[PDB]
Amino acid sequence: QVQLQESGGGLVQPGGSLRLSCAASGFTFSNYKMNWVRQAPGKGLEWVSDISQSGASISYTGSVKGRFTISRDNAKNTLYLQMNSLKPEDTAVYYCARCPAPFTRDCFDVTSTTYAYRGQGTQVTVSS
Amino acid sequence: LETQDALYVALELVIAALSVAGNVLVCAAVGTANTLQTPTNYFLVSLAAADVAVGLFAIPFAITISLGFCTDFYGCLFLACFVLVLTQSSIFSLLAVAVDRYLAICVPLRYKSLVTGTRARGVIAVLWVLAFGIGLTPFLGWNSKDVKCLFENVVPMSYMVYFNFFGCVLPPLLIMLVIYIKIFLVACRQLQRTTTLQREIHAAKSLAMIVGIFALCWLPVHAVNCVTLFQPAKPKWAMNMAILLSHANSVVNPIVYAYRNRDFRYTFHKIISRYL
Amino acid sequence: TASIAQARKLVEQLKMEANIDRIKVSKAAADLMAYCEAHAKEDPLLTPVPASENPFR
Amino acid sequence: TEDQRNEEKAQREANKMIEKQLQKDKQVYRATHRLLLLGADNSGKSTIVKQMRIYHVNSGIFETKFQVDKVNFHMFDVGAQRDERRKWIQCFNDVTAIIFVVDSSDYNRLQEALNDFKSIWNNRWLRTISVILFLNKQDLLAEKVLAGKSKIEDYFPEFARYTTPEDATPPRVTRAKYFIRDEFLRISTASGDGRHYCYPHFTCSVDTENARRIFNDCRDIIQRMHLRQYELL
Amino acid sequence: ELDQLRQEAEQLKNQIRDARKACADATLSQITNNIDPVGRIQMRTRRTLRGHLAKIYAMHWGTDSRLLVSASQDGKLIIWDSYTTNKVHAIPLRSSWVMTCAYAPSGNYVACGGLDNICSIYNLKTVRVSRELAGHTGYLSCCRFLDDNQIVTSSGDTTCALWDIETGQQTTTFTGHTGDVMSLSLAPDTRLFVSGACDASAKLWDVREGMCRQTFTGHESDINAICFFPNGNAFATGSDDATCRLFDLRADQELMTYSHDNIICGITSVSFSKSGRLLLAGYDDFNCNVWDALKADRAGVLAGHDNRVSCLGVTDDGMAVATGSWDSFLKIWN
Ligand SMILES: CC(C)CCC[C@@H](C)[C@H]1CC[C@H]2[C@@H]3CC=C4C[C@@H](O)CC[C@]4(C)[C@H]3CC[C@]12C
Ligand SMILES: CC(C)CCC[C@@H](C)[C@H]1CC[C@H]2[C@@H]3CC=C4C[C@@H](O)CC[C@]4(C)[C@H]3CC[C@]12C
Ligand SMILES: CC(C)CCC[C@@H](C)[C@H]1CC[C@H]2[C@@H]3CC=C4C[C@@H](O)CC[C@]4(C)[C@H]3CC[C@]12C
Ligand SMILES: CC(C)CCC[C@@H](C)[C@H]1CC[C@H]2[C@@H]3CC=C4C[C@@H](O)CC[C@]4(C)[C@H]3CC[C@]12C
Ligand SMILES: CC(C)CCC[C@@H](C)[C@H]1CC[C@H]2[C@@H]3CC=C4C[C@@H](O)CC[C@]4(C)[C@H]3CC[C@]12C
Ligand SMILES: CC(C)CCC[C@@H](C)[C@H]1CC[C@H]2[C@@H]3CC=C4C[C@@H](O)CC[C@]4(C)[C@H]3CC[C@]12C
Ligand SMILES: CC(C)CCC[C@@H](C)[C@H]1CC[C@H]2[C@@H]3CC=C4C[C@@H](O)CC[C@]4(C)[C@H]3CC[C@]12C
Ligand SMILES: N#Cc1c(N)nc(SCC(N)=O)c(C#N)c1-c1ccc(OCC2CC2)cc1
């Protein structure tokens, strides 16, 4: 069964560093493209970064370009997102998103409200 | 038999055989592939059938005329008119292919509205009956009745120069020339809006591979007829090599038209992968 | 604020998938092989019918 | 056994009538060019065409039929559907062109539009279908950049180092407009084996030239397709 | 205490998984090493149904094994005679974007639907629309007839619905799936029916009580194809991960997985033969593969089409098979 379990999160001080990990089970993680989304209180979902199967193509949005980094290990079926230079408005609950089709580059419903191949997310609070 | 005319007849025979082998292939490809059952390939299969008829009927009739036999005047006039009908049908179908390409390139929106199956079949039938009526004009009222079976003895050069060349060869040649010039201009304009000179030169070569070959094939014999009627002045083999170049058009048509397209190559790859 | 309902709904469905008698996989294997062996003769795809019986030819 | 040949010939006559009806419908099928229309709620895709001849509202699809230069166009807008659109979009792999309307005024929702354009462009089945870009609501974006209250640098830092291209044919207004244009183009040019291209066009909500723009873009699309078919492009 | 319910669901799913692993005595693949495989299977195109303008999206065989319905994306529902190839009826659809079609068991009514979110019923033994079942907030992906009075429909709003034809109201609704439901298949006993959604879950439903009986989460991608075994105890499913999976209603777990490293395209249609020995699945490689339901090996390849195969249908007796692809042509194999 497709299962994505994320770890870490909680509350972190602004300007520091944090790491969010995600473990996948029930499929071949090495064949699907991954994306990261975030939901703010009273806001919609927000894509922040993506990563291909073998990491050949990596992209981020303009809001977190450079400050955030993403990596993946197919030998362990794990996804990692390192977060730095955190701002008080960048607080949101972060979710993972899997490509609906294997080894493709068209991720349509990764930011959809009721996507199935996504985790339940971790709460990430940032404040002084 | 003379060694020169014998070699000419042998070359005509091998040209006819190669033309048949190349054109029945395209015919069967269009017949067995549902993806090729499109109105743009109707003119191509018409050209293939015309080349098949030329290789199977026109070239043997020209060879029989070349043998210099003594038969009925009508017996040789019928073969000459059949050869003329088949060549004019091939030329008309090639012109129809050029017109279809022009309509597809310059009129891309209305193309699907203009070129349909019924209209394509109607145009094919019209050009076929037109070539039949044109080639049979010596049979009706343009025969050289003054008898050894020879083209000049049954068809005068006046019909071949005024009605055939100046009437049924130069207008289609000019139409194809303007069509392909406009196609090249459109391709260059689209490439400028999208190493670009390399692609322009490639497109120019691909478009010239039709016009220059049509010229090198047909223009020799017509120019020979013109310099034979306007100012009669090595006729031992120049006429024969002109006939060879003119008949090589039927065998070179599949390699330039069909064997270069995308859908035809895909169908060929599929049928050779299924049989391998 | 409504997930507390939906989530609980899900978990209820789970126990309605729990109260079920599950047979062995070998039992299902034997049943499937028997059903395939019984109707094997009545399969035109598995056993191509002759031209006389085939309505397509 | 006359009843069998009678029913068979009646079936053949019915098939003849059905074939005649299908051949008659093929003319009106080939005469109209099917077009897809997409865009978020903020985009003005509902009123993107001003030369609309008929605008019908079906149960879940908005149909717009309009004729330009004796060429028909039948655009479809699928709005009465859920957020998940990765399945039914494959139904639109045979349209002539796709018009993705983007509200260039808003900056926060611009990333969502960019992601949607990237997903539509990199589709496996929509690779042979081009996407026409129409940046609607230029007046709001112009007033926003002239007011200076909301800066694009908060959402796109590259605009700090980006400058207007040399081939711009109209300063901060044009700079931001061409920045959005190039940001969409670099995503469009990121994939595709020359089989499809994007046609960016800056239009307003009050601009009536959208019909001619769509006509010319579709003409160029089909022309390039025919050129690639003949190895001419 | 929402996370408490989260871990409650997690431990219930772990219980279900360990229970399924407990009854897993063996795999049917290693059990079927005693019987002789089907070997090579070759089928030829008997008839080619031409006439469709746009891409065909769905098809369904009648109970008489003679007439077949086919829906084309240009708004046409055509009935074809498999024996004589001549068309019987050509219904012009109001909404061109049709994605599903159905043939009633009595052969008098036909169903249609698509992006218009309306299920239209057309009477062939009157041709006009009899009823227009509306209410769905999603696209009609699949439709099947239970009787001449009730009809099951699958919509893209993560819900399925059994409607009454004469009444036109939702007799029963199913709100279990989380993704867009792509296809369903009726059991031979017409009491149960399985449905696969865009999620990794396929659910069994009852037409009487109106609730999900069993759930299968063996797949990994969007489940687009589904078909029940002729006996009613098993069913096969296909997804975009290039993998078919055979589940059992009684074992409540996956039995066999049909896949190949050379096959990397998605799957569109899945169906069984008369005896269930063969499994015909159309893939996006412009062809269909005939796997062995007991040996899991490609026995035959049907590649007469030129585009991705959209629909696949087997007759009630298995005399012939029909494959409809997006090239607007239907290939009949035998
Ligand atoms: C010298 C002559 C007799 C050669 C014979 C020409 C034959 C072999 C070729 C020429 C034109 C071809 C036809 C042109 C296109 C179509 C329409 C298609 O829907 C069915 C096949 C069909 C009907 C082709 C069958 C083969 C065909 C008839
Ligand atoms: C020996 C001479 C007459 C050869 C004649 C050429 C014939 C065989 C070829 C050339 C062009 C061909 C036609 C061109 C296209 C169509 C339209 C199609 O919908 C039916 C087949 C049909 C009508 C073809 C039938 C065969 C055809 C007429
Ligand atoms: C310059 C010379 C060659 C003029 C040639 C015109 C001929 C070849 C063309 C021009 C327009 C063509 C017609 C266009 C419309 C139709 C309707 C179609 O259902 C049958 C064929 C038919 C009737 C075509 C027959 C051939 C046609 C008349
Ligand atoms: C092959 C020889 C006989 C000439 C070929 C005839 C065909 C190819 C030519 C001759 C006359 C031409 C037609 C003349 C009139 C029109 C009206 C124009 O608005 C659309 C194109 C159309 C319909 C032309 C299409 C091509 C056409 C049919
Ligand atoms: C048989 C020979 C001698 C005469 C053939 C004439 C035909 C093939 C040529 C000559 C001039 C050509 C036309 C000139 C330009 C146009 C306008 C364009 O918008 C549609 C095509 C159309 C209408 C061309 C169709 C083909 C055409 C009619
Ligand atoms: C009538 C005669 C005397 C004048 C026309 C000359 C013609 C035959 C010449 C001019 C340009 C030539 C072409 C130039 C380049 C190429 C590319 C080569 O890879 C294949 C042949 C091809 C396509 C040539 C074939 C012959 C050609 C078409
Ligand atoms: C498509 C391109 C090559 C242009 C087509 C037209 C050319 C090849 C035509 C136009 C007029 C023709 C000429 C008309 C008159 C004569 C004089 C005669 O004693 C010999 C041939 C000759 C010299 C002709 C041969 C070919 C010709 C030069
Ligand atoms: N003369 C002439 C002639 C011609 N003026 N035109 C064309 S075909 C040009 C067209 N239809 O467009 C052809 C041909 N074929 C011939 C021809 C016919 C029979 C021949 O075999 C006899 C051998 C002893 C010389 C030779 C040549």
SS3 of E244, please? strand
Closest Cα of chain B to E275: distance in Å?
Answer: 29
Nearest-CA residue for atom 16 of ligand 2:
B121
Contact A17, A83 (CB under 8 A): yes
| 3 state SS of D176 | helix
Q: What is the DSSP letter of E274?
A: S
Cβ partners under 8 Å of residue B129, min gap 6: none
Q: How far apart are CA B34 and CA D161, in angstroms?
A: 55
- Residue B213 CA: which ligand is closest? 6
* Separation between Cα atoms, residue E294 and residue E34, nearest integer Å: 11
Distance B56 CA to ligand 3 centre (A): 29
Return the closest-CA partner of residue D96 out of E260, C47, B109, C40: B109
Nearest to E100 by CA among E153, E143, E163: E143
By DSSP bridging, strand A17-25 and strand A34-39 are: unpaired
d(CA D110, CA D132): 17
Name the nearest CA neighbour of D25 among E72, E117, B33, B107: E72
For the structural domain made of C4-56, what CATH number should be given? 4.10.260.10
Query: Measured between alpha carbons, how far is E328 from E57 in angstroms, rounded to an integer?
Result: 9
Calculate how close chain C gets to E104, using CA atoms only, in Å: 23
Distance CA(D162)–CA(D120), nearest Å, equals 26
Q: How many CB atoms lie within 10 A of CB E63?
A: 13
Dist CA E41 CA E59 (whole Å)? 24
Residue B13 makes CB contacts below 8 A (sequence gap 6+) with B59, B63
Q: Which domain holds residue B153?
A: 1-276
Q: Is B231 exposed, middle or buried (0-12, 13-18, 19+ CB in 10 A)?
A: exposed
Contact between B21 and B254 under an 8 Å Cβ cutoff? The reply is no
Residue ranges of E 291-320 with Cβ closer than 8 A to chain B: 303, 306
Chain B residues within an 8 Å CB radius of E54: none
Amino acid at E67: L
Give the contacts of B28 (CB within 8 A, at least 6 positions apart): none
What DSSP letter does each residue of A11-34 carry, written as one string?
Answer: EE-TTSEEEEEEEEESS-GGGS-E
Q: What is the CATH number of domain A3-126?
A: 2.60.40.10
Q: Which two tokens stand for residue E51?
A: 């006439």
List beta partners, residue A58: A51
Strand partners for D77: D37, D62
Q: Are strands E109-114 and E98-103 parallel, antiparallel or unpaired?
A: antiparallel
Q: What is the C-alpha to C-alpha distance for residues D84 and B74, in angstroms, rounded to an integer? A: 77
At position E53, the amino acid (one-letter code) is L
* Strand-strand pairing, D199-202 and D131-136: parallel
**What distance in Å separates the CA atoms of residue E305 and residue E331, rounded to the nearest whole number?**
7
The CA-atom distances, in angstroms, between B98 and each of B74, B133, B179 are 35, 22, 7
d(CA E291, CA E300): 7
Q: Is E309 left (phi over 0), alpha (psi -120 to 50) or beta?
A: beta
From B44, B94, B119, B121, the mutation candidate for ligand 2 (largest count of ligand atoms within 8 A of CB) is B121
Chain centroid to Cα E128, Å, comes to 26
Q: Is the CB of B87 under 6 A from ligand 8?
A: yes
Decide: D32 and E87 in contact? Cβ < 8 Å: no
Phi, psi of C25 (to 5 degrees): -70, -30
The three-class DSSP label of residue E43 is: coil
Q: What is the dihedral of CA A23, A25, A29, A32, to 10 degrees?
A: -100
Helices (H), chain B: 3-32, 40-53, 59-66, 73-106, 111-114, 117-135, 137-140, 151-154, 157-158, 166-168, 170-192, 196-229, 238-253, 262-275
Pairing of strands E181-186, E170-174: unpaired
Minimal Cβ distance to A108: which of D86, D158, D191 = D86
Nearest chain D residue to E224, by CA: D87
Nearest protein CA to atom 6 of ligand 3, as residue: B123
CA of B201 to the centre of ligand 6 (A): 13
List the beta strands (DSSP E) in D105-187.
131-136
Q: Which two tokens mark E300?
A: 């035959």
- Residue matched to tokens 């058009």: B249
**Which residues of chain E make contact with B38, given a CB cutoff of 8 A?**
none
Report the C-alpha gap between B63 and B120 in whole angstroms: 34
Phi and psi, residue D107, nearest 5°: -100, -35
A10: left (phi over 0), alpha (psi -120 to 50) or beta: left
Length, in residues, of chain D: 233
- For residues A58 and A13, the answer to whether their CB atoms sit within 8 Å is no
Backbone angles phi, psi at E81, to 5 degrees: -90, 115
CA atoms within 13 A on the CB side of E54: 28
Which tokens in the block code for residue D220?
Answer: 């160029």
Q: Which single residue is written with the structure tokens 């499994």?
A: E279
Q: Name all domains of chain E by residue range, CATH numbers in brackets.
A: 2-333 (2.130.10.10)
Contacts of B67 (CB under 8 A, 6+ apart): B1, B9, B149
Whether residue A108 contacts residue A63, with contact meaning beta carbons closer than 8 Å, is answered with: no
Is there an atom of ligand 2 within 6 Å of B48 CB? Answer: no
Could you tell me which chain D residue has the CA closest to the CA of E199?
Answer: D84
Residue with structure tokens 């409650």? E8
Q: How many angstroms separate the alpha carbon of residue B89 from the centre of ligand 8?
A: 15
Q: Is E65 exposed, middle or buried (0-12, 13-18, 19+ CB in 10 A)?
A: middle
Residue E323, CB-side half-sphere exposure with 13 Å CA sphere = 32
In terms of Cα–Cα distance, which of B238, B258, E259, D87 is closest to A27?
E259
CB-nearest to D222 from B101, B109, B203 is: B109
Distance (Å, whole) CA D103 – CA E199: 32
Distance, CA of B113 to CA of D32 (rounded, Å): 9
- One-letter amino acid identity for E240? D
The response to whether residue B9 sits with its C-beta less than 6 Å from ligand 8 reads no
Q: Find out whether D91 and E115 touch, Cβ atoms under 8 Å.
A: yes
Instruction: Nearest by CB to B35, from E48, E50, E306: name it.
Output: E306
Q: Which residue has the tokens 């926060």?
A: D108
Task: Please report which ligand is nearest the Cα atom of B115.
Answer: 4
Q: DSSP of D182-209, one letter per residue?
A: HHHHHHHTTS-SSS---EEEE--TT--T
Burial of B89 (C-beta count, 10 Å sphere; 0-12/13-18/19+): buried
The CA–CA distances, whole Å, from B131 to B117, B170, B215, E124 equal 21, 15, 20, 50
CA dihedral D157, D159, D160, D162 (to 10 degrees): 130
Distances (CA, A) of A16 to A67, B64, E96, E236: 11, 97, 56, 51
- Euclidean distance between CA atoms E238 and E37, whole angstroms: 22
> B33 to chain E: which residues are within 8 Å by CB?
306
Give the angle A46-A51-A52 at the CA atoms, nearest 5°: 135
CB contact under 8 A, E13 and A101: no
DSSP state of A102: T
User: How many CB atoms are located within 10 Å of the residue B128 CB?
Assistant: 18
Residue D146 tokens read as 């002239």
Nearest to B6 by CA among B57, B54, B67, B55: B67
Q: What does each C-alpha distance from D203 to A97, B126, D175, D214, D216 come to in angstroms?
A: 35, 48, 16, 11, 15
**Can you tell me the distance from the alpha carbon of D5 to that of B128, in angstroms, rounded to the nearest whole number?**
38
CB A71 within 8 A of CB A51: yes
Coil vs helix vs strand at A55:
coil
Q: Does any ligand 4 atom lie closer than 6 A to the CB of residue B96?
A: yes
Is the C-beta atom of B114 inside 6 A of ligand 4? Answer: yes
Considering Cα of B69, then B75, then B79, then B81, what sign does the dihedral take? positive
Which residues, 6 or more positions from D57, have their beta carbon under 8 angstroms from its beta carbon? D63
- Other beta carbons within 10 angstroms of residue D127's beta carbon come to 16
Q: Give residue for tokens 């007011």.
A: D147
Neighbours, chain A (3 or more CB pairs < 8 A):
D, E
Q: Which residues pair with A5 in a beta bridge?
A: A23
CB–CB contact E266 A27 (8 Å): no
Contact E49/E329 with Cβ under 8 angstroms? yes
Q: C-alpha B172: how far from its chain's center? A: 11
Tokens of E301: 């390849």
**Is beta strand E109-114 parallel, antiparallel or unpaired with respect to E254-259?**
unpaired
Query: What total of structural domains would you count in chain B?
Result: 1
Check: CB of residue E142 under 8 Å from CB of residue E100: yes
- Nearest residue by C-alpha to atom 27 in ligand 8: B243
- Say how far apart CA B154 and CA B151 lie, in whole Å: 5
How far is the CA of C11 from the CAs of C1, C2, D30, E6, E199, in angstroms? 17, 15, 54, 8, 18
Number of Cβ atoms within 10 Å of the Cβ of D209: 12
At E304, phi and psi to the nearest 5? -75, -20
Residue B173 beta carbon below 6 angstroms from any ligand 7 atom: yes
Structure tokens that stand for E77 in this block = 């529902």
Residues at the binding site of B for adenosine are 152, 225, 246-247
CA torsion angle for E259, E222, E142, E85 (degrees, to 10)?
Answer: -40
Ligand 1 mean position to B265 CA, how many Å? 19
- β-strand partners of E80: E68, E87
Q: Which residues of A touch D124 (CB under 8 A)?
A: 101, 104, 106
Q: Which residues contact A6 (CB under 8 A, 6 or more apart)?
A: A20, A21, A22, A23, A94, A95, A96, A119, A120, A121, A122
Phi, psi dihedral angles at B243 (to 5 degrees): -65, -40
Domain boundaries, chain A: 3-126
A chain contacts of residue D119, beta-carbon cutoff 8 Å: 106-108
CA distance A69 to A53: 16
Are E51 and D19 in contact by the 8 Å Cβ rule? The answer is yes
Q: How far apart are CA E123 and CA E130, in angstroms?
A: 6
Laid out side by side, the sheet with D71-78 consists of D54-57, D61-68, D71-78, D32-39, D97-103, D131-136, D199-202
> CA-to-CA distance for E112 and A37, rounded, in angstroms?
38
What DSSP string runs through C1-57? --HHHHHHHHHHHHHHTTS-----HHHHHHHHHHHHHHTTTT-TTTSPPPTTT-S--
Of the bound ligands, which one is closest to the alpha carbon of residue B37?
1
The whole-angstrom separation of Cα E291 and Cα D45 is 47
Q: What is the DSSP string of D50-95?
A: SS-SEEEE-SSEEEEEEEETTEEEEEEEE-SS-S--TTGGGGGTT-
CA torsion angle for E50, E56, E58, E61 (degrees, to 10)? 0
Angle between helical axes of B170-192 and B196-229 (0-180°, round to 10):
170
CB atoms within 10 A of CB E166: 11
Asked if residues A20 and A81 have their Cβ atoms less than 8 Å apart, the reply is yes
SS3 label, residue B122:
helix
Instruction: Please give the Cα distance from E30 to E26 (Å, whole number).
Output: 8
Residue pair C23/E250 in contact by the 8 Å Cβ criterion: yes
Question: CA B273, CA B271: separation in Å to the nearest integer?
Answer: 5
**What is the longest distance spanned by two Cα atoms in chain C?**
69
- Please name the method used to determine this structure: cryo-EM
Distance from CA of B263 to the nearest CA of E (A): 11
Q: How far apart are CA D200 and CA B159, in angstroms?
A: 58
**Which of B24, B30, B42, B89 has the most ligand 2 atoms within 8 A of CB, as the residue to mutate?**
B42
Q: CA triplet E108, E109, E112: central angle to 5 degrees?
A: 155
Q: How far is CA A75 from CA A37, A72, A78, A100, in A?
A: 24, 9, 8, 21
Instruction: Report the C-alpha dihedral over residues B196, B202, B208, B210, rounded to 10 degrees.
Output: -130
User: In this structure, are residues E332 and E80 in contact, taking their beta carbons and an 8 Å threshold?
Assistant: no
Q: Which residues of D touch A112 (CB under 8 A)?
A: 83-84
- Beta-carbon contacts of D38 under 8 Å, excluding residues fewer than 6 positions away, are D45, D78, D98, D99, D100, D101, D116, D120
Q: What is the number of alpha carbons within 13 Å of residue E319 lying toward its C-beta?
A: 19
- Distance (Å, rounded) from C-alpha B31 to C-alpha B45? 9
Torsion of CA D172, D175, D179, D182, to 10 degrees: 160
**Which value, to the nearest 10 degrees, does the dihedral of the CA atoms of residues A105, A111, A117, A123 take?**
130
Side-by-side strand order, sheet with E243-248: E223-228, E234-239, E243-248, E254-259
Closest to E47 measured CA to CA, from A13, D142, D62, C56: C56
> Is the shortest distance between the CB of B118 and ligand 3 below 6 Å?
yes
Residue D132 pairs in a beta bridge with D99, D199
**Distance between CA D96 and CA D78 in Å, rounded?**
16
Spatial CA neighbour of A80 closest among A117, A28, A29: A29
Question: How far apart are the C-alpha atoms of B141 and B137, rounded to whole Å?
Answer: 6
Is residue E112 within a helix (H) or strand (E), and if so which, with residue range? strand E109-114
Residue B99 CB less than 6 A away from ligand 5: yes
Token duo for residue B221: 């014999």
d(CA D113, CA D39): 8
Ligand 5 pocket test, pick from B102, B176, B179, B181 with the greatest ligand atom count within 8 Å of Cβ, gives B102
User: What amino acid occupies position B158?
Assistant: S
Is beta strand D32-39 parallel, antiparallel or unpaired with respect to D71-78?
Answer: parallel
For residue D50, give how far its alpha carbon lies from the nearest alpha carbon of chain A (Å): 30
Pairwise CA distance, residues E258 & E279, whole Å? 10
